[PDB]
Structure 1
Amino acid sequence: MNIFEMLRIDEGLRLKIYKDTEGYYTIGIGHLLTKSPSLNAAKSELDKAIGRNTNGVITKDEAEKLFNQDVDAAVRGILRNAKLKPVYDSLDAVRRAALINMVFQMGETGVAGFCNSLRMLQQKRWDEAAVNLAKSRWYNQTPNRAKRVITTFRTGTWDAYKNL
């Protein structure tokens, strides 16, 4: 297991534009196109992202290319963020993957405001951090995924993704 395999489990793979759990047009392995309700707007984003006129359908290789860019961007975003970089740097590689997963899902600003949980993670108070992380819109709206990410933070193991 690694961050790519973990996010591939959590995000799926679909090669046609679809709406994500928040109702937003997405494609590939969790590549958010736009929060606009216009499908045309989403197609335009997709064509810009891929570099050709797609009319809403991509290949598996294209989905993987966007996915690699999005994982890289999440990590780069963490390392440029004054609230996230210290916690990220304090973590082991498995827990770093859990933080990348959260930033991939909800964005840098979104995770950087989990300040109390970030402090508990910096403190390596893992059970406390897990309890605090669940007191969130994130957990309530995507509880199975959040439970997997939280288990990863609590244990520093991949047990929540074993058998997935």
Structure 2
Amino acid sequence: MNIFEMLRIDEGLRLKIYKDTEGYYTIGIGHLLTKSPSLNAAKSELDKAIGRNCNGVITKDEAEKLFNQDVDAAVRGILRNAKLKPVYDSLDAVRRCALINMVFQMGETGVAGFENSLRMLQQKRWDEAAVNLAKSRWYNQTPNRAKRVITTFRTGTWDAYKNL
């Protein structure tokens, strides 16, 4: 299993503009288009992102291209972030995937907001950190996905996804 397959499981793939769990306009593999209520603002952003007149729809190829860009940007973001980089560097390969997953869903800023949990991960206090991560809006809003990520940090294996 790898970051791409993990994220493809968590986000799904949709080839027509859709609304995410928060109600925002998204397309592909969790690619947020805009937080704006306008489907028109969304269709404009989409065309700008793809470089063609899409009319709210894209091909598999376009979805994957967007996905490659987003995972890349998430990774580069972590490495440039002063709060995030040290944590990332301290982790093993599977757990690194869990942090990337959080960053892709919630942005750098958002994850950087989990101060206490980050400190516990850096310390390698797995169980403690899993309990702390669960005390967030994130966990209450998307509990099954949060649980999968949480189990990933807790165990350092892909068991939560080997099911799926």
Tell me the TM-score normalised to structure 1 length: 0.99
Could you give the per-residue CA deviations for residues 24-58 of structure 1, whole angstroms, max 9, x where no partner exists? 00000000000000001011111011010101000
- The equivalent of 1:26 in structure 2 is 26
Tell me the TM-score normalised to structure 2 length: 0.99
Distance in 2 separating the partners of 1:67 and 1:61: 10
Distance in 2 separating the partners of 1:125 and 1:162: 24
Distance in 1 separating the partners of 2:142 and 2:11: 12
Which sections of structure 1, spanning at least 5 residues, go unmatched? Answer: none
Distance in 2 separating the partners of 1:88 and 1:145: 20
- The equivalent of 1:54 in structure 2 is 54
Q: Quote the offset at 1:125 in angstroms.
A: 0.1
Q: Quote the offset at 1:163 in angstroms.
A: 2.1
Which sections of structure 2, spanning at least 5 residues, go unmatched? Answer: none
Alignment map for 1:123-138 (pairs within 5 Å): 123-138=123-138
Q: Percent identity?
A: 98
RMSD: 0.4
Q: Quote the offset at 1:89 in angstroms.
A: 0.5
Could you give the per-residue CA deviations for residues 90-110 of structure 1, whole angstroms, max 9, x where no partner exists? 001100000000000000000
Distance in 2 separating the partners of 1:112 and 1:39: 30
Distance in 2 separating the partners of 1:88 and 1:101: 12
Q: Quote the offset at 1:154 in angstroms.
A: 0.2
When the two structures are aligned, how many residues end up with a matched partner?
164
Q: Find runs of 4+ consecutive structure 1 residues off by over 2 angstroms.
A: none
